[PDB]
Amino acid sequence: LLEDRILTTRNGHTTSTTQSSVGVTYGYATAEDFVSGPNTSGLETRVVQAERFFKTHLFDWVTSDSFGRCHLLELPTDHKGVYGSLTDSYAYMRNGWDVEVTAVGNQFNGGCLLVAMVPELCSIQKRELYQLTLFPHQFINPRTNMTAHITVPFVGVNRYDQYKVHKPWTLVVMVVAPLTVNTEGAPQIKVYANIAPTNVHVAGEFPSKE
């Protein structure tokens, strides 16, 4: 009746467990490229305390959404915790993302979401949504699962970034088949993301405002 595809991800002192797992999609690489190059002159450092889960609501999947309905979240996003303060203390940073997206209704719902991590996503056209599977992705399909998990490294024309002006990654969730509730389905599904920065490195310490 229910399932043994059971995963626990731990990032720092935060853990997340699902019993409907499907596995994790690794995008573009299995490990980060070189974190120390000439552009930081050996002055960069890792700050492990920012590597942990933070949470955000994305949207509510309702039966009136149809194929192509999208929700985008540019990354990094607002963060009121230590990763967030890192961006006000250092001029340059790089990190990857460990991403878990949840859409829980129950197994009597039908329909399907595609969740993908797309780089440099300066908005998308309608016909391009038919090829969104070219990006690191996973589906959420209620008869099988409730969680999508994607892990992606840092990418960009530069080895360290200035997040106050450039966002390398956008998480996108797209309705590929509309939600059905039938007589026993949940009446709508709220979609939430649980995200952890991975490998965060900073360089170039700012003055304070004092």
């Binding site: 440099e120 996503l121 300066c122 070219l134 099988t144 960009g156």
Partner: protein, 186 residues
Amino acid sequence: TTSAGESADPVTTTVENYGGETQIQRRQHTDVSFIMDRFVKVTPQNQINILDLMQVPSHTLVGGLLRASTYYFSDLEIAVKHEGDLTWVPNGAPEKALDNTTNPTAYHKAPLTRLALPYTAPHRVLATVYNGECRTLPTSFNYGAIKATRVTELLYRMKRAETYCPRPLLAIHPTEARHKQKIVAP
């Protein structure tokens, strides 16, 4: 085969599942290096042209395929029809440098000038799309610039090309059930 479709691990079945035989394929025409390595015409400005690969139209083979990647690297060849002598200046040069002939200047020789140029940007790779403003792309994304009294034709050819992270490649959307065309016939 059945499989878990939510997962995204690729599944490639073959005709052997019902008794056929997979044949051998020779895929050198879809090799990235090979296929990007041919000239493509851009419409030039009269005098100053900055060398920017995003000028090649997106419907051409090279424009379609360059936009199917998000980061790329290549060296460059250009072939230019121009009046006067042609000066090239690298990435980061002041525009006024385009008037000083110690910068690589090719003296007019009919009918056109073909030049091999290095990648010159300060970045380890360039990108066809950049999410800074959201259309505009950082000004350092270029291969320098050229200038002559009049430039009439400009063709770009990517050398040693590398592409990273594929992006949508779209065909014509047919209006009828099949996109039909007049195909070369005796």
